[PDB]
Design a protein around this ligand. Sequence first.
Ligand SMILES: [Cu+2]
Length: 129
Amino acid sequence: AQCEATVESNDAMQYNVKEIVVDKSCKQFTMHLKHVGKMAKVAMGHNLVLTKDADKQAVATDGMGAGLAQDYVKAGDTRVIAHTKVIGGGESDSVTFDVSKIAAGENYAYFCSFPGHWAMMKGTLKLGS
Ligand SMILES: [Cu+2]
């Protein structure tokens, strides 16, 4: 609703939403992440990272080497448009980004960069109205 969406992540390594559509009327957009499971962040942590589809694996790979304290996102990664921190069960986080950083027709991927999670936790985001 509005210029925001909510994605729930669980203990089975899956997002509940696979597609997010950003309305052209939005200048800013907010992504809310809820970890609805009950596992600790050191075992089942989840975040939400947004990049072009092409940068997915490169960003996830560098992110794994950043560490948990860095939310598994390489500090100042120029390929990451937006990202939340890594959360454990019972928690949540939000990230707001400038819609101008998004282009029509372009393909964007949101995925979890916690080690090994990217291959199963990913979705598509695009500008469309
Ligand atoms: Cu995850």
